[PDB]
Amino acid sequence: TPEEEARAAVDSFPEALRQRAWDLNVKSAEKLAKYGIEKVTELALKLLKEIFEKYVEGKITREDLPEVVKKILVLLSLVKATAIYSKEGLEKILELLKEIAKELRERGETLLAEAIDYLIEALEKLHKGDADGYLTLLTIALYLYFKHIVENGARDPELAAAVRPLVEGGYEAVARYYFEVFAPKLEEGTEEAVKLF
Numbered sequence: 142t143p144e145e146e147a148r149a150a151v152d153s154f155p156e157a158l159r160q161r162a163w164d165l166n167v168k169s170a171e172k173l174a175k176y177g178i179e180k181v182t183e184l185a186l187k188l189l190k191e192i193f194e195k196y197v198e199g200k201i202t203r204e205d206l207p208e209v210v211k212k213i214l215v216l217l218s219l220v221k222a223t224a225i226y227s228k229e230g231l232e233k234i235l236e237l238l239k240e241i242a243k244e245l246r247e248r249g250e251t252l253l254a255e256a257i258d259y260l261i262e263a264l265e266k267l268h269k270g271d272a273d274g275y276l277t278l279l280t281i282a283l284y285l286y287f288k289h290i291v292e293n294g295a296r297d298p299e300l301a302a303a304v305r306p307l308v309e310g311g312y313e314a315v316a317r318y319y320f321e322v323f324a325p326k327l328e329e330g331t332e333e334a335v336k337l338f
Contacts, residue, residue, distance in 0.1 A: 147284075148277040150312035154320060162324040163272040166221055169331040173222035176338045182230035184337060185219035186237060188212060193241050197248070203297050214330030215337070224267040231268055235261055252292060256285035276316070283323070284308065284315040 151159070173181050192212055195201060201209055223230040238261050246254040263278035287304040294301025307314045 143281055144277060147281045147312040147316075148273065150316050151273060151276045151280060153313065154316060158320050159272065159276060162276065162320060165324055165327055166267070167225065169218055169327050170222040170225040172331055173218060173334055174226050176335075178223065178227045178230055180338070181219050182223050182227060182233060184334075185216060185223055185230075185234055188216045188219070189234070189237055189241075192216065193244075197244075203300075206297075206300075211330075211333060214326060215333045216330075218327060218330035218334050220264065221267060224264040228268065231264065235264065250289070252285050252289035256282045256289060258282075259285060276319070280312050280316045280319060283319060284312055287315065 192209070195209075220234055223234055238257055242254045242257040242261070245251075245257065259278050259282035263275050263282060266274035266278055284307075287308050290297070290304050291301050291308050294305075307318055310317075
């Protein structure tokens with residue numbers, strides 16, 4: 142099963158590295174939880190809606206890419222804080238993501254919709270405190286996201302070319318990218334979120 146294979150990929154990496162990623166998520170969540178979980182959730186919902194509305198309208202150009210990544214990093218930091226500390230807030234964020242995934246599927250962005258389904262599942266594992274289950278589902282969500290970029294690479298061929306080795310390398314390559322590149326960037330998202338308050 143995709144979940145079993147991705148999980149196997151996650152377990153092949155050193156425990157210390159996985160523990161670092163987990164500890165980093167929790168520290169970011171505590172930093173954001175200091176600002177009120179209701180406020181964190183409200184901001185998360187606002188940013189999620191903005192990003193989705195802009196995306197569907199095709200107003201994200203290649204020139205726009207650095208700013209959107211920053212907005213996503215903030216959104217993920219806020220959402221993760223909510224997943225750790227508020228079931229009700231989490232339920233609202235998840236409900237919205239399910240609607241977005243359905244809409245994207247109806248629009249034919251099927252891989253992106255699948256990526257979002259797996260993000261939703263990862264957030265539920267995060268809420269339950271399952272670090273390995275979280276990293277497994279997050280790896281699948283990133284893999285599907287990159288696959289979406291490669292299948293749509295006509296929109297940014299260079300970006301497709303950059304992430305293609307990750308797709309060709311499978312869940313192991315995606316997990317490797319996460320541990321070595323993505324997880325350290327979480328702090329960047331947290332800092333931008335702090336600035337918003």
